Design a protein around this ligand. Structure first.
Ligand SMILES: CONC(=O)c1[nH]c(Br)cc(=O)c1O
Ligand SMILES: [Mn+2]
Ligand SMILES: [Mn+2]
Length: 180
């Protein structure tokens, strides 16, 4: 498939390694579930771009094995007092002192927003949704990052989108709702 080839073409090795690991945690083959392969990679990259942009302001919980992810969640909760999320989130924002759930969607942002929000049902985890179209939605329209940092995520997402479309892989990808 050209999709696996493109995943290994545009995503640096670190992310692809982690993506295959998270794909085995579902008995899943990235050579078959390749749209999930790419979505997992893209999301991972968004989380990593977000953390680095914010003296470290964000703690990455995404990309950890579940033992260490929940260990970091628990350490944060016990030293700040934030409420234990029911589900593992993506970042902790030490500045606003909240958990952030990063959403990357091929659908409208408002829709995947309502989806994550209705799933988490704890208005104490901040949601920030990014599309491949330079659109973003976010709890209380608080976007956390400076405008520039968000420019950078949106440019990267739109670049994956155009690079998939130059390979004739974007119609398949947007017409899939896995990785979401
Ligand atoms: C293994 O834990 N799963 C996740 O963290 C996760 N899954 C999906 Br689908 C979309 C996300 O945005 C996300 O953060
Ligand atoms: Mn996550
Ligand atoms: Mn997420």
């Amino acid at each position: 498939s050209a999709m696996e080839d493109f995943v290994r073409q545009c995503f640096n090795p670190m992310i692809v390694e982690l993506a295959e690991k998270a794909m085995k945690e579902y008995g899943e083959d990235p050579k078959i579930e390749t749209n999930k392969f790419a979505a997992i990679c893209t999301h991972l990259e968004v989380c990593f771009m977000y953390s680095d942009f914010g003296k470290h302001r964000f703690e990455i919980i995404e990309g950890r094995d579940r033992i260490m992810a929940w260990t970091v969640v628990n350490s944060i909760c016990n030293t700040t007092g934030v409420e234990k999320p029911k589900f593992l989130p993506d970042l902790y924002d030490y500045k606003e002192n909240r958990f952030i759930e990063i959403g990357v969607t091929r659908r409208e942002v408002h829709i995947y927003y309502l989806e994550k929000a209705n799933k988490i049902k704890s208005e104490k985890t901040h949601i920030h949704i990014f599309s491949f179209t330079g659109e973003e939605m976010a709890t209380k329209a608080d976007y956390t990052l400076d405008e520039e940092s968000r420019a950078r995520i949106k440019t990267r997402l739109f670049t994956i989108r155009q690079e998939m479309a130059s390979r004739s892989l974007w119609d398949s990808f947007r017409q899939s709702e896995r990785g979401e």
